[PDB]
Ligand binder design. Structure first.
Ligand SMILES: Cc1cc2nc3c(=O)[nH]c(=O)nc-3n(C[C@H](O)[C@H](O)[C@H](O)COP(=O)(O)OP(=O)(O)OC[C@H]3O[C@@H](n4cnc5c(N)ncnc54)[C@H](O)[C@@H]3O)c2cc1C
Ligand SMILES: Cc1cc2nc3c(=O)[nH]c(=O)nc-3n(C[C@H](O)[C@H](O)[C@H](O)COP(=O)(O)OP(=O)(O)OC[C@H]3O[C@@H](n4cnc5c(N)ncnc54)[C@H](O)[C@@H]3O)c2cc1C
Ligand SMILES: Cc1cc2nc3c(=O)[nH]c(=O)nc-3n(C[C@H](O)[C@H](O)[C@H](O)COP(=O)(O)OP(=O)(O)OC[C@H]3O[C@@H](n4cnc5c(N)ncnc54)[C@H](O)[C@@H]3O)c2cc1C
Ligand SMILES: CC1=C(CCOP(=O)(O)OP(=O)(O)O)S/C(=C(\C)O)N1Cc1cnc(C)nc1N
Ligand SMILES: CC1=C(CCOP(=O)(O)OP(=O)(O)O)S/C(=C(\C)O)N1Cc1cnc(C)nc1N
Ligand SMILES: CC1=C(CCOP(=O)(O)OP(=O)(O)O)S/C(=C(\C)O)N1Cc1cnc(C)nc1N
Ligand SMILES: [Mg+2]
Ligand SMILES: [Mg+2]
Ligand SMILES: [Mg+2]
Lengths: 583, 583, 586
């Protein structure tokens, strides 16, 4: 007895627990489609409107759940449309399987219609990249691709000649290795290295703990170390929410998608504990130029001493190590450094609240995000696009350990807001999901609003319409000699786009319109997707990387101009608080 | 004295006559943007909403004019979004320059934000693919890229570290080699090979001339050879219009994007003259299995004998060679083969007119295309997307040598209708331009309807809304065991999408609505873009590759079913006409 | 009726006129081997000892005859050993087909022994690079590969799963397109452009004609234009021999593999006619910085204005264009520029002759090459390795249009001497063939001396043993601040290496030993290969790019030292001759 090789392939996906997958059919992938069609009760095919959205959504599946995302594209242009999502998966180091259609083996290398050597297309993006040439081994090739994508935390691509999945293979021969999958049991953290790290951290005058998403399991330990030891916390932007934003000694993130207290404290710190962190600005921004001792905890040998010369680098799990530090320390009294940082945070949060709390007038991004906070459930998931929204969401969203947020962290491809929200709702139908996107990024993937409608995925889409590539406009202001170019453009009314895909929607341009529109959207999203198009000003958000508040550092004229432009008259530089507490 | 290297780069583009270029800015390409900004009077930057549209439009520029198209993308995701247009340019062998942003040289290889080794990304698509590393040589690298793209008829990609274009270089050193550019003067066509080819063609009983776009300069000679010698003409789909469609011995194209008379005649022909033709279905469809002698004229040695064993292959220009054949032949009387083919064409065109000429009822693609014909100017340009529209446009558009039509011929990427129309209008502001697209393809690039609005490009967009990937649905009907999957989807109202980008638009779903809506669109398009969303039936167009009309070939039951489904009761098989004239 | 797919593939090779091919067998290519075995009366397999030599020989085949060269390698390491020869073919733009073994389709992607995805290995080097996946289409894929390698003048690679050539396919379906082959059309010169070019050339005060191997069919026209118009000639190194070296207005080549008169004249010229030339040093050496007008003739649009901005560019065949120039000019009187160059060339040739004509004492490269000239037939072929030998052979070999010489022109892979000579003797059994190689380069491919013995290929191998990478030592002298490193090494006695592979050989270290050894070698090579291991001094050849002879440019002390080191006491700078005829050292 026999099975179609394509049926076996789908049974390999099922064995690995793949719930849903994305793509667009074509003749060159119609034999995989045929196998999917017979298996609708167990694996859910999501037909997207552009293959990039399928690839992005597959990456987001893995970001959210840790479970391999799966997408496909038809030969030639279907597969090449996957690229921005495949590169997102590579750079955000999440497991994705991509299946690429190909001409049957009898026509390959004949220069026939939309027939090319597809293997070189995927060689750079992929950890594993093969053209299948045999039906009987095709289940194994798919199984190998999955196992490698997991092991290597990246993209596996298989090009499949369309004849192979329609061939019969022996039913009893193929298997999946999902049953062997497991996670490692690790030794405890290296005892003598962690005692020595702890002493250096505690001997510091101006310590900081600076964590990334490698510390995602360690929020409790981070907050209790901070509180016990009187050591402020700062994070990478993606690590926002691992410790609740409300924690009074959470400084935020550094650089540009950043918060003032974090930049200022980092410049003064004498010892940094760098935990589960691969901050890509470390060298180029000279972040640690002032730092006396640099301590690291990371799971990956490839990261040890990577971002700065490191005094002690412990190769270990973040949680296990932070718990072992906590077990060997006890209460320290409040210090001037602690108090200064607490005061600086309070001043900064008062500034952000002042922006949020306006009640009437021309709409700014700040109030839109307040309105999101007001309708957000405590375990909401945020799919965030790329641009000023990362900066503004990082400052204004009030996250806790119960939330999740995702974006394209390092490749930073625009357009991910829509697909990330699709993936979030497919994985978590009972959780509230937002897509927060700028107009530029929403434009790029707008057609897949129709996918939210088609699959009845009740996403709350919020488009920030400034008629600009605002993040880039600000860059041009900073660097370019000549006039702005390519950064200001003509309006798109996304409420009308939504109507065109048969999604309920609203457009607002005044602060006073927000509460009722957001309450209506909250309610619609109990059953159907909704879109709010928020027409916002072109005001530049405060640049945390170019602060002009300290009269020892900047001219009075520069400070007065900065305070005026950024509504920052009541912000004080960290040096004010350092002086206040005697530093 | 010095010049900024970026300014010199723009002066190289200007020297080569580049009128317009496409892309989206980013920090990693802001120094090229800065140079563009100072040169708005001479080179016109078109800000697109998705970089794929810029790449597609650059390819279309070259398809239309023969002059290198230029696009750019920012580091990482900007550039990877170009791919579908770059592969279109490679496969349609037209010259395109792509500029890719990159991190400055001081941060390359530091694993910083959106910083990667970009060179491997482009290695497969590109004829020339380099990362610039020096400012003083950067003008030369761009000049080299252009000269190679032209010489090699393909894609040149340059990755540009953002620091380089802001560096000063000596003003007097750089140059462009546009002044050296020229086209070759060729020998005349090989005398003895062309006399011998001519004899074999004339000795045939059932000759055909089968040309592609390499014969684009030879329409007059093709038609006069056909008329003088009594030899029917057939073409590749892209070669439609080189000879007017109204010519009574034009059979159409073969395979699927095809016309019945061409498929039927090709199966009977004893001698084929294959001219300027690289038909990719030749081998896989066994097109020439019956052919006794196969004669070829091509300019490219790589094509000689490529598609079939060739009796005589002349390496020469198509026009020069066809004129030399014409100069050595004279009138032949009408033959039975000629008469049979003329009768078959007349029968086929009566069938297509019967579809077009319905006046009321549920709208089909056939009447939409009649309505296009009725408002089309004699020199209109058609940008055609990918799907059933290629099949239907090929049958119904009434083209002449004065028209142009473009699509993604061989890569066949969906989404090209919008960008191709943008490029057409930018090159030919005084010519009428259509974008004919299916709903699937229009969806993929829909956001760049806003670019037509922004640049006041008066395209007539016609969307064929069947709520299907119809071309693929029909494939699944033919091959798939299990139920249709991924090929039927939820409506998008493109009149509402158009309203959202501030474009006038109409939606129609009945035949009787067409005349007034098309007349309004014709008039609007004297000054602004317009969109018609044509809601059409799901009727399958007649499959020219699966004819069931000949009672010696097919069962009576199969013929009756085919005639019913395709409204083909009055079509006769070619054998009827062959018999009528005694063959 | 059926044929094995492998048999059909070999038939495709035969239809395309392939006489011989190179490689080393392995399990992963044994089905092609089986087909070759059956066809050994009609196509000839040459088993090499390292696959790089097969690839290099295939490239050399194409360089010599214009016929596609064919090589193969087994899966994994057999194929990756081809690389240096494949990049040689790419960079020297000659057609080569490379067949790469692969695991059968039933074990591909199983991570079995020697089994990998081979397609990405070849993506950069190859114009065409495919893995075959079907037996019935395999003959076409090979046919396509050959046709594109020719049309695109580069490398085509096909990875062949070993099961496919053992499958039966229909006998009647496959074909080769060899019957349809043609070479690219030769474009013709625009009449008015050629007249304007001519007018500019003839208005020049200090003209030069500077040709490369694109002018290989135009030697008669080049030499007659030079004589009629009184315009000196210079060439790229590879273009040596297109015009006989004897011609008194042949200046040589520029840069380093160069002759003094060419460098000096190029620095003074006001108009250059750059014909069939892609000189890779143009920009980096600032060759044309002071050239007033630059006139170019090339058949490739990718080259026009590449190396300097053109004043007139002609997209046409060199010999047609040069003939059209010649047809519209008449004899001109001598000029001061002409006579200054003629005198400079005599002075230079007298210097080279002085080095060649020593009769006793420590052996130098110069006398070895004189001894080669003394036994060389007028239609000899030279396969030249990479290093100082390019420099010395360029100066001393006395070539004419009847000769051929080849090296790795642009990739410049060492080791090509031995495989190029193998190829030469296979293609030209009745012509004398030399392999001129340094010790470093000969070392790299030494084992394939055995191939010359095995196939009875009577090459005259001459190894220049300095116990150095001399060309690189001289670079370190010029740039490096610290002591020499990696450039001086232990001796290898290549006469003993030759004995080990069963080749007759000689070792010499004194000038007076040369005549008798070279006569013996000439006679041995009527029937069998031979090797001469010439133990030469570590003297640096005169650096034509760093002349120290003109007291207007250089210190007396530096001139003194130059003359002493290079035995150059009798050399004059070009300015001496310019001044004699009334011209300024511009
Ligand atoms: C438009 C845009 C702008 C941005 N600019 C900023 C910015 O200004 N500031 C900013 O902070 N970010 C910014 N980013 C994000 C930035 O590019 C990086 O992605 C981010 O700073 C790196 O975060 P990370 O170190 O948490 O994650 P990763 O880079 O994923 O690193 C995780 C680290 O944790 C380690 N690890 C994993 N598991 C464990 C474990 N169990 N125990 C220990 N170690 C472990 C890994 O080995 C790795 O070193 C921006 C993003 C966007 C979209
Ligand atoms: C959805 C879709 C389906 C399609 N299916 C069909 C189909 O069923 N039928 C069909 O016909 N097409 C079809 N096509 C197009 C098809 O893929 C090929 O692109 C087309 O058939 C090849 O046309 P061509 O030979 O004219 O062009 P090219 O492939 O561009 O070849 C041009 C040839 O002309 C030669 N040449 C160039 N200049 C000269 C000169 N001056 N003199 C002499 N020779 C010269 C070239 O060397 C080359 O061989 C389809 C397209 C799409 C989008
Ligand atoms: C160790 C070493 C050092 C070297 N250093 C030197 C050096 O110092 N000096 C030196 O001169 N060389 C040197 N070379 C060689 C050098 O690298 C180049 O290969 C050589 O200078 C280029 O020669 P070319 O232009 O003749 O050949 P190619 O680069 O092959 O160019 C031939 C040109 O002719 C054109 N063409 C072809 N056919 C025609 C036709 N029918 N009509 C018109 N145009 C045609 C082509 O399009 C092309 O532009 C060295 C080689 C080695 C091994
Ligand atoms: C244009 C752009 C950006 C503008 C985004 O404009 P938006 O309108 O979406 O957002 P806003 O800033 O106006 O609120 S940010 C981005 C950087 C971070 O890389 N780039 C570059 C960019 C360009 N193209 C793609 C596909 N992805 C990218 N990241
Ligand atoms: C889905 C699809 C097609 C459906 C196009 O649907 P449309 O709705 O645009 O057109 P219609 O047929 O319904 O009128 S045709 C195409 C083939 C020719 O390649 N494919 C495959 C395809 C898939 N993805 C991209 C980007 N380009 C492609 N060509
Ligand atoms: C080492 C060396 C050279 C030394 C050759 O030493 P030889 O001993 O062969 O020659 P000689 O100069 O001593 O007479 S020349 C060459 C340059 C031109 O590229 N290189 C670099 C080189 C290094 N490795 C290989 C395979 N090929 C090369 N060309
Ligand atoms: Mg915006
Ligand atoms: Mg459709
Ligand atoms: Mg040596």
């Amino acid at each position: 007895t026999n099975i179609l090789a394509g049926a076996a392939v789908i049974k390999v996906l099922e064995a690995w627990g793949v719930d849903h997958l994305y793509g667009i059919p074509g003749g060159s992938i119609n034999s995989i489609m045929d196998a999917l069609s017979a298996e609708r009760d167990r694996i859910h095919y999501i037909q997207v409107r552009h293959e990039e959205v399928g690839a992005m959504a597959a990456a987001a599946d893995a970001k959210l759940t840790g479970k391999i995302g799966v997408c496909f594209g038809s030969a030639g242009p279907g597969g090449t449309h996957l690229m921005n999502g495949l590169y997102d998966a590579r750079e955000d180091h999440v497991p994705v399987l991509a299946l690429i259609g190909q001409f049957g083996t009898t026509g390959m290398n004949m220069d026939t219609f939309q027939e090319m050597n597809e293997n070189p297309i995927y060689a750079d993006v992929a950890d594993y990249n093969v053209t299948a040439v045999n039906a009987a081994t095709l289940p194994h090739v798919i199984d190998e691709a999955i196992r490698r994508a997991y092991a290597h935390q990246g993209v596996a691509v298989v090009q499949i000649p369309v004849d192979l999945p329609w061939q019969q293979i022996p039913a009893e021969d193929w298997y999946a290795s999902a049953n062997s999958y497991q996670t490692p049991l690790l030794p405890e953290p290296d005892v003598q290295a962690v005692t020595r790290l702890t002493q250096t951290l505690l001997a510091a005058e101006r310590p900081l703990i600076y964590y990334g998403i490698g510390a995602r399991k360690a929020g409790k330990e981070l907050e209790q170390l901070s509180k016990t030891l009187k050591i402020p916390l700062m994070s990478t932007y993606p690590a926002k929410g691992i410790v609740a934003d409300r924690y009074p000694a959470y400084l935020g993130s550094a650089n540009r998608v950043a918060q003032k207290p974090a930049n200022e404290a980092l410049a003064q710190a004498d010892v940094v504990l760098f935990v589960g962190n691969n901050y890509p600005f470390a060298e180029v921004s000279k972040a640690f130029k002032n730092t006396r001792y640099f301590l690291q905890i990371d799971i990956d040998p490839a990261k040890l001493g990577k971002r700065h010369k490191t005094d002690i680098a412990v190769l270990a799990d973040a949680q296990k190590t932070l718990a072992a530090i906590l077990a060997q320390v006890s209460e320290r009294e409040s210090t001037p450094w602690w108090q200064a940082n607490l005061a600086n945070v309070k001043n900064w949060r008062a500034y952000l609240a002042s922006l949020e709390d306006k009640q009437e007038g021309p709409l700014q991004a700040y109030q839109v995000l307040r309105a999101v906070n007001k309708i957000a459930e405590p375990d909401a998931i945020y799919s965030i696009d790329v641009g000023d929204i990362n900066l503004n969401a990082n400052r204004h969203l009030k996250l806790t350990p119960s939330n999740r947020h995702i974006t394209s962290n390092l490749f930073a491809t625009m357009g991910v807001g829509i697909p990330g929200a699709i993936a979030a709702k497919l994985n978590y139908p009972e959780r509230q999901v937002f897509n927060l996107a700028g107009d530029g990024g929403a434009s790029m993937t707008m057609q897949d609003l129709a996918t939210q409608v088609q699959y009845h995925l009740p996403v709350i889409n919020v488009v920030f319409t400034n008629c600009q590539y605002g993040f880039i406009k600000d860059e041009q202001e900073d660097t370019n000699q000549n006039d702005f170019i390519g950064v200001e453009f003509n309006d798109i009314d996304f409420s009308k786009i939504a109507d065109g895909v048969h999604m309920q929607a609203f457009r607002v341009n005044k602060i006073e319109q927000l509460p009722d529109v957001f309450e209506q959207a909250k309610a619609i999203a109990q059953h159907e997707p909704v879109l709010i198009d928020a027409v916002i000003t072109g005001d530049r958000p405060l640049p945390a990387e170019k602060l002009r508040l300290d009269s020892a550092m900047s001219s009075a004229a520069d400070i007065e101009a900065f305070k005026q432009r950024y509504e920052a008259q009541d912000l004080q530089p960290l040096s004010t608080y350092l002086k206040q507490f005697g530093l």
